[PDB]
Amino acid sequence: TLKSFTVEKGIYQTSNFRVQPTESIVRFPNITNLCPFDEVFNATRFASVYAWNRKRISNCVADYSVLYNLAPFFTFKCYGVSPTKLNDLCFTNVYADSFVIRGDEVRQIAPGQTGNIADYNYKLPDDFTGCVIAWNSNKLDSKVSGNYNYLYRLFRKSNLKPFERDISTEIYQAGNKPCNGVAGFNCYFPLRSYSFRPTYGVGHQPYRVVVLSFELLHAPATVCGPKKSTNLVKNKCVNFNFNGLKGTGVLTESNKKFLPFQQFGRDIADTTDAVRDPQTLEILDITPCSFGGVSVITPGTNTSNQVAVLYQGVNCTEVPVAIHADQLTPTWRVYSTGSNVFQTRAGCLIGAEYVNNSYECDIPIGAGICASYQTSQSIIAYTMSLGTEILPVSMTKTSVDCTMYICGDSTECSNLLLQYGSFCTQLKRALTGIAVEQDKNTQEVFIEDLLFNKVTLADAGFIKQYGDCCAQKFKGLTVLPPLLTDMIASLSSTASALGKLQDVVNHNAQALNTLVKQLSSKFGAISSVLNDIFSRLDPPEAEVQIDRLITGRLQSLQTYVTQQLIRAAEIRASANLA
Amino acid sequence: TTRTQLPPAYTNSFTRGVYYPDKVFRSSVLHSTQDLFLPFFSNVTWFHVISGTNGTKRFDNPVLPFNDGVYFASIEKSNIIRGWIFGTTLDSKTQSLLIVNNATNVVIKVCEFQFCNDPFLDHKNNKSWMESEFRVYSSANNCTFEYVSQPFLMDLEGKQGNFKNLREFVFKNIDGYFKIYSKHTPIIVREPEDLPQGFSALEPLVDLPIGINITRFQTLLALHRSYSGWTAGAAAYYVGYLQPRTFLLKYNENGTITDAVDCALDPLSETKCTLKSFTVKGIYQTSNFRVQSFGGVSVITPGTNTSNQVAVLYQGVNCTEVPVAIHADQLTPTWRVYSTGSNVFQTRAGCLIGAEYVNNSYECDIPIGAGICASYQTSQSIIAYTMSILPVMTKTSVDCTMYICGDSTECSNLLLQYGSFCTQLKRALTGIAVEQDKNTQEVFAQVELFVTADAGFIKQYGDCLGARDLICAQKFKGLTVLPPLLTDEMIAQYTSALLGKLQDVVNHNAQALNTLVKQLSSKFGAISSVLNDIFSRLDPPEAEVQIDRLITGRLQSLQTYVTQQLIRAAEIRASANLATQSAPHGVV
Ligand SMILES: *[C@@H]1O[C@H](CO)[C@@H](O[C@@H]2O[C@H](CO)[C@@H](O[C@@H]3O[C@H](CO)[C@@H](O)[C@H](O)[C@@H]3O)[C@H](O)[C@H]2NC(C)=O)[C@H](O)[C@H]1NC(C)=O
Ligand SMILES: *[C@@H]1O[C@H](CO)[C@@H](O[C@@H]2O[C@H](CO)[C@@H](O)[C@H](O)[C@H]2NC(C)=O)[C@H](O)[C@H]1NC(C)=O
Ligand SMILES: *[C@@H]1O[C@H](CO)[C@@H](O[C@@H]2O[C@H](CO)[C@@H](O)[C@H](O)[C@H]2NC(C)=O)[C@H](O)[C@H]1NC(C)=O
Ligand SMILES: *[C@@H]1O[C@H](CO)[C@@H](O)[C@H](O)[C@H]1NC(C)=O
Ligand SMILES: *[C@@H]1O[C@H](CO)[C@@H](O)[C@H](O)[C@H]1NC(C)=O
């Protein structure tokens, strides 16, 4: 995971281990009677548009595929629920309503939008959990036989409170003065205009509307899905589906003193550590099954391939190497028993054996235990036994071209980014500040061939590439040459103590590599390249796609600038020390 | 019955009227919630019912407005109160609720009634059984809701005496739901006929789905006959209107509310809100005031361990434009602000109220500004005047996938579309840990106070399956603490061979960790804060953006935490370099 075919000796981190679930249990309350749905809606002439009835539905099991398989019933544009997943959710306090309307203006008076009837009486929130279903009445039952439905919503002054009828009646209010007798002002009553098909060659179809309201889930549920129930299993990392609170963990007996009305347990930070079974009234504690971190200890790629493994913060007996029935990284088991597993305050050590010697410390393990490679040759762990000068000067000056880096080869990208204010200039100034401050560091602070030779195995610039190539380049990244050129002017062995000056060069290198690789990130868009997106996509969503791309790239480069400032502070302190 | 009018009395509600707002169970947590409640120390009516004029019935049943709730209670001795009928107009043209208490049946009924002007009930059952007791009305039609159960009160009879019932009821109606909360308790003395200053949790009793429009509050009485006319014993009930508020509750071990605090009553109350604790000495910033000019408000207190006296500083406003009277309004005025009886003094910062400016000078304790400081001194009051160990922190690590995506493989798949945006976080945390290890080696390797807020835990192994502490709760979601390399014993051996400055770092780390773990509850503009519910209710095409918004929010939170950790690490390393006896994560 280090992207290398050789690895120096040390302790490293690769991934984490977790215990997978082995089976599934589902508990749901039992309701013998099937939930009536044809009776509640498929019935005689529906409730009036002005005074629509409401029917509470409770304590029933409903299957909604019957509406699918029977008749057209167009619309059915659910607003906040998956139409297919309706049979997988257990409901609460569901309401049904009977509606009558012409249908010519049904689109405007549709839920979530303003319409004539919608602005007259019936008001809905910005979004509702239920679904709107319009029963498109076909001919010979669409009042083709004759007109009926005396009531109509001819007039209404303004909208009303949410979920309210239109029992308001009486003649229209004359503009000159409030009207009572309709004598000189044509003040009409607000209804009586239904005329379905008396002489209409082309007209409207009855659109009886039903809408639901649900998803509380805090109180005990009443309407619940037709999903079956099985016996429950305790003391195992299993998947549970208690009344809808699906999760993974271990269920155990508990001593919590719930009051009768209380159902769901909670914890310090929004985690259900307790639950009540639907069928049998009993209290259960939930605890996530075991997981932890893994570290690999190696003594050197050239030296030997024998390694050791350290499991972080787990008890050896509970998670040994012989429980590989569901553990992550199944094949990465390290034989059956590599060595005597050892217990440390940090966890479990496998592949090594513990000695009774007090040697000098090496690649370390937590709580004062150091490992070593020693005599045939194997890995040991023990308790540690008590028993020139190099300082950084300044980092490599750098600069970034905002319009080149983000909006490359796209004037339209720059045009759209222009609406983001000026988020490139101030960053340019911020980089320039540390850039010019490095020069004053060098001026304030102020064998050689051997040091120059040793360092130059990993350096940048050299001939500083002032012409043709190189050194990453492109995407508007440049290196500012130092102002003071080389007017500034045991060790020969491989055992070089020059860790400090190599450290800053390395860290800058990985910072630059991370920044340049950030461009390969998709950010969840269709494509990470602007030309392809512009070519084969329309503007309306192209703007939002490029907007998200701009946000991601600017966020990444802001983080890079912040890291540069943080490192520049330390380099400043080190320079002032010297 | 040719009765005369009476003046209703007034009483103080004290610290009563706290009820469980939610069905969940919590323990040892300090939860805060906003809901309708009876404000602490509010005026409550004292409707008193007796056999007036030595046997003349007192029609003390006005048509009280229902409004937004009630705190109906009683200090009743024997069974004399029944009925809480409600209605918009109280006639045959209005749907109305009715609650009788026949023996052991509530008979909660929703029918249109031709209501009696002054309805009552017979506490003594009529002779030959089948007591009529139906003078309350004469006509019933359009019965929608009927409910029968055990009596709404199962209170024991008055028995021999010397003790009385204290039935407490709360009625609430919201969004077509009618909730009835109840609680009972005995009483010791009746000399003032006043509610004792005691907490009272009001458990839920009944919930009804009726969505009837209601605007008025009525009451019934239970008296059989003249034991001329109709007479009974003695009883009394109070009415407390309801308004929205915000409270901080204190769940105990077993999960029962023992005491709560209002959040707008006094300056100390609001300070305890903004600190989320029941104990506070110093200066704190609470809120800001705006005039329908604006400014900020700060509270100066000597410490809850000493006194409840306070003082208020308004920043950037002269004392002229904001006197004490404006507290009757503005939405920043539930305040008392006392008055100008305590002299108001103007400083450079702004307007200070609640302190007296002395003519002396001392070394000051609470810094106000511009050379002015306040202190608690001698009787005793707040007076303002003019003034006259090295840390070395704890290693921490975080897990990307499980924290961002808790037990969801689809969320992991979508996160991998972000690629590697937190491997650098792991590198930064590991480098920081190596940094403190090197600092300890440099400061201690050249050849006992032992404070405990550190405790003697066993590093909190995986055996945490049994409150659940605070470290175990944060152990989940992937926030672990790696153990130090050097144990305390060898540090002591090195020392042998050779306190706020330490507590502040630990407190800062703890509060940062708590903020990070609490940030998960943020909605972030989605419809739910749990991915499982999103999968259950939503299809993938929009669930992906819904999850993406939370992913962006959580990534921002993690990046912020990492930046704060780096900035703190720089300072602690500077201190370690400055530190050129053994203490927990420090030196003396
Ligand atoms: C106090 O007043 C209530 C007012 O309703 C009385 O309610 C009684 O309730 C029961 C059960 O609902 C009724 O029984 C019903 O009718 C017959 C029995 O007569 C039988 O077919 C069933 O048992 C059916 O549920 C009963 O009729 C009804 N009382 C009257 C007078 O109608 C209650 O009995 C009264 N006394 C108490 C609570 O001690
Ligand atoms: C309440 O009951 C009725 C009204 O609901 C009234 O009682 C009678 O009211 C009429 C109205 O003129 C009088 O003529 C009768 O003399 C009243 N009868 C009695 C017995 O008082 C009255 O308003 C109220 N009181 C009573 C006792 O009924
Ligand atoms: C509930 O009250 C309504 C309102 O009076 C009654 O509705 C009446 O029903 C009859 C039956 O055809 C109609 O002729 C009337 O016009 C209706 N009155 C209206 C609409 O105001 C209803 O009957 C009552 N329900 C009962 C008594 O069970
Ligand atoms: C309820 O009825 C009253 C009539 O007393 C009316 O004024 C009010 O608008 C109705 N609705 C509500 C929500 O109060
Ligand atoms: C909780 O209930 C137990 C069981 O009787 C009791 O001993 C204890 O005092 C109660 N209160 C607390 C705070 O534990």
Name the residue among B540, B438, B424, B60 with its Cα closest to residue A521.
B424
Identify whether the C-beta of residue A264 lies closer than 8 Å to the C-beta of residue B24: yes
Name the residue among A289, A235, A248, A243 with its Cα closest to residue A264.
A243
CA atoms within 13 A on the CB side of B153: 25
Q: How far apart are CA B437 and CA B395, in angstroms?
A: 9
Element (H, E) at A274: strand A274-276
3-state secondary structure of B18: strand
Identify whether the C-beta of residue B71 lies closer than 8 Å to the C-beta of residue B240: yes
Dmax (CA) of chain B: 106
Identify whether the C-beta of residue A27 lies closer than 8 Å to the C-beta of residue A279: yes
Rounded to 10°, the helix B540-578/B500-518 angle is 170
Q: Chain A window 543-562: which residues touch B at a Cβ cutoff of 8 Å?
A: 559, 562
Query: Residue B418 and residue A262: Cβ atoms within 8 Å?
Result: no
Residues with Cβ < 8 Å from A121, sequence gap 6 or more? A49, A50, A153, A156, A159, A160, A164, A165, A166, A168
Task: Give the DSSP letter of residue A108.
Answer: T
Q: How far apart are CA A58 and CA B549, in angstroms?
A: 35
Q: Which amino acid is at A171?
A: I
Report the residue from B207, B520, B527 with minimal CB separation from A269. Answer: B520
Q: How far apart are CA B171 and CA A61, in angstroms?
A: 32
Residues with Cβ < 8 Å from A517, sequence gap 6 or more? none
Name the residue among A46, A96, A47 with its Cα closest to residue A67.
A96
- In angstroms and rounded to an integer, the radius of gyration of the C-alpha atoms of chain B is 32
- Per-position b or e across B428-441, b if 16+ CB within 10 A of its CB: bbeebbebbbebbe
Name the residue among B317, B309, B261 with its Cα closest to residue B289.
B317
Beta bridge partners, A343, equal A348
Q: How far apart are CA A528 and CA B11, in angstroms?
A: 71
3-state secondary structure of A229: coil
A320 touches chain B (CB under 8 A): no
- For CA atoms B283, B284, B290, B295, the dihedral sign is positive
Identify whether the C-beta of residue B522 lies closer than 8 Å to the C-beta of residue A406: no
Q: How far apart are CA A170 and CA A173, in angstroms?
A: 9
Residues with Cβ < 8 Å from B543, sequence gap 6 or more? B534, B535
Q: How far apart are CA A140 and CA A129, in angstroms?
A: 34
Residues with Cβ < 8 Å from B387, sequence gap 6 or more? B361, B362, B363, B364, B371, B372, B373
Q: Chain A window 212-251: which residues touch B at a Cβ cutoff of 8 Å?
A: 215, 218-219, 244-248, 250
End-to-end CA distance of chain A, in Å? 38
Q: How far apart are CA B287 and CA B310, in angstroms?
A: 16
B163 touches chain A (CB under 8 A): no
Identify whether the C-beta of residue B137 lies closer than 8 Å to the C-beta of residue B114: yes
Q: Residue A192, by phi and psi: left (phi above 0), alpha (psi -120 to 50) or beta? A: left
Element (H, E) at A365: strand A364-365
Rounded to 10°, the helix A425-445/A539-577 angle is 20
Q: How far apart are CA B20 and CA B519, in angstroms?
A: 25
Question: Does B93 sit in the ligand 3 pocket, CB within 6 Å?
Answer: no
- Structural domain spans, chain A: 10-19+290-383, 25-226, 232-287, 399-577
Strands annotated E in A106-162: 132-136
Beta bridge partners, B197, equal none
Identify whether the C-beta of residue B285 lies closer than 8 Å to the C-beta of residue B76: no
Q: Residue B566, by phi and psi: left (phi above 0), alpha (psi -120 to 50) or beta? A: alpha
Element (H, E) at B474: helix B471-475
B9-246 architecture in CATH?
A: Sandwich (2.60)
Q: Which amino acid is at A27?
A: R
Supply φ then ψ for residue A349, to 5 degrees. Answer: -110, 125
Identify whether the C-beta of residue B386 lies closer than 8 Å to the C-beta of residue B473: no
Q: How big is the A-B interface in CB pairs under 8 Å?
A: 152
Identify whether the C-beta of residue A370 lies closer than 8 Å to the C-beta of residue A315: no
Q: How far is CA B565 from CA B184, B280, B312, in A?
A: 53, 28, 35
- Number of neighbouring beta carbons within 10 Å of residue B375: 18
Q: Residue B229: nearest ligand to its CA?
A: 2
Say how far residue A176 (Cα) sits from the centre of its chain: 60
- Nearest ligand 4 atom, CA B215: 5
Residues with Cβ < 8 Å from B86, sequence gap 6 or more? B66, B96, B97, B214, B216, B217, B218
CB-CB neighbors (< 8 A) of B521 in chain A: 269-270
B174 touches chain A (CB under 8 A): no
3-state secondary structure of B364: coil
Protein residue with least CA distance to atom 13, ligand 4 = B213
Task: Give the DSSP letter of residue B452.
Answer: -
Identify whether the C-beta of residue B155 lies closer than 8 Å to the C-beta of residue B148: no
Residues framing ligand 2 (Cβ under 6 A): B 117-118
Q: Residue A402, by phi and psi: left (phi above 0), alpha (psi -120 to 50) or beta? A: alpha
Say how far residue B71 (Cα) sits from the centre of its chain: 19
Q: What is the CATH number of domain A25-226?
A: 3.30.70.1840
Q: How far apart are CA A403 and CA A414, in angstroms?
A: 7
For chain A, what's the residue count? 578
Q: How far is CA A388 from CA A455, A490, A575, B577, in A?
A: 16, 11, 17, 19
For chain B, what's the residue count? 588
Q: Which amino acid is at B123?
A: H
3-state secondary structure of B442: helix
- The CA distance from B521 to the nearest CA of chain A, in Å, is 7
Residues with Cβ < 8 Å from B158, sequence gap 6 or more? B77, B78, B79, B164, B165
CB-CB neighbors (< 8 A) of B493 in chain A: 386
Report the residue from A258, A267, A566 with minimal CB separation from B566. Answer: A566
Burial (0-12, 13-18, 19+ Cβ within 10 Å), A443: exposed
Name the residue among A293, A334, A296 with its Cα closest to residue A313.
A293
A489 touches chain B (CB under 8 A): no
Q: How far is CA A512 from CA A426, A560, B28, in A?
A: 20, 9, 49
Residues with Cβ < 8 Å from A512, sequence gap 6 or more? A398, A472, A477
Q: How far apart are CA B226 and CA B124, in angstroms?
A: 11
Q: Which amino acid is at A445?
A: V
Residues with Cβ < 8 Å from A495, sequence gap 6 or more? none
User: For chain B, how are helix, strand and coil distributed in percent, rounded to 5?
Assistant: 20, 30, 50
Supply φ then ψ for residue B518, to 5 degrees. Answer: -75, -25
Q: How far apart are CA A474 and CA B209, in angstroms?
A: 68
Q: How far apart are CA A100 and CA A49, in angstroms?
A: 5
Experimental technique, in short, is cryo-EM
Residues with Cβ < 8 Å from B281, sequence gap 6 or more? B301, B302, B303, B306, B366
* Per-residue 3-state assignment (H helix, E strand, C coil) for A326-348: CECCCCCCCCCCCCCCEEECCEE
User: For chain A, how are helix, strand and coil distributed in percent, rounded to 5?
Assistant: 20, 15, 60
CA atoms within 13 A on the CB side of A423: 16
Q: How far apart are CA A503 and CA A455, in angstroms?
A: 11
A126 touches chain B (CB under 8 A): no
B209 touches chain A (CB under 8 A): yes
Q: How far apart are CA A110 and CA B555, in angstroms?
A: 39
Ligand 5 geometric centre to CA of B75 (Å) = 28
* Per-residue 3-state assignment (H helix, E strand, C coil) for A381-405: EEECCCCCCCCCCCCCCCEECHHHH
CB-CB neighbors (< 8 A) of A292 in chain B: 462
Query: Residue B494 and residue A386: Cβ atoms within 8 Å?
Result: yes
Q: How far apart are CA B245 and CA B495, in angstroms?
A: 57
Identify whether the C-beta of residue B278 lies closer than 8 Å to the C-beta of residue B272: yes
Query: Residue A570 and residue B566: Cβ atoms within 8 Å?
Result: no
DSSP B496-533: HH--HHHHHHHHHHHHHHHHHHHGGG--TTSS-S-HHH
* Per-residue 3-state assignment (H helix, E strand, C coil) for B252-313: CCCCCEEEEEECCCCHHHHHHHHHCCCCCCEEEEEEEEECCCEEEEEEEECCCCCCCCCEEE
Ligand 1 geometric centre to CA of A280 (Å) = 32
Supply φ then ψ for residue B208, to 5 degrees. Answer: -130, 135
Q: How far apart are CA B307 and CA B297, in angstroms?
A: 21
Beta bridge partners, B216, equal B65
Tokens in use for B432?
A: 């920081």
Q: How far apart are CA A347 and CA A366, in angstroms?
A: 9
- Number of neighbouring beta carbons within 10 Å of residue A412: 14
Q: Which amino acid is at A443?
A: Q
- Nearest ligand 4 atom, CA B213: 1
Q: How far is CA A352 from CA A316, A344, A373, B550, in A?
A: 14, 12, 10, 43
In chain A, residues preceding a discontinuity (C to N beyond 2.5 A) are 375, 387, 446, 469, 486, 489
Supply φ then ψ for residue A403, to 5 degrees. Answer: -65, -30
Residues with Cβ < 8 Å from A527, sequence gap 6 or more? A533
Identify whether the C-beta of residue B112 lies closer than 8 Å to the C-beta of residue B96: yes
Element (H, E) at A562: helix A539-577
Identify whether the C-beta of residue B220 lies closer than 8 Å to the C-beta of residue B120: yes
DSSP A35-51: PP-TTTTSSSSPPPSSS
* Per-residue 3-state assignment (H helix, E strand, C coil) for A232-261: CCCCCCEEEEECCEEEEEEEEECCCCCCCC
Q: Residue B139: nearest ligand to its CA?
A: 3
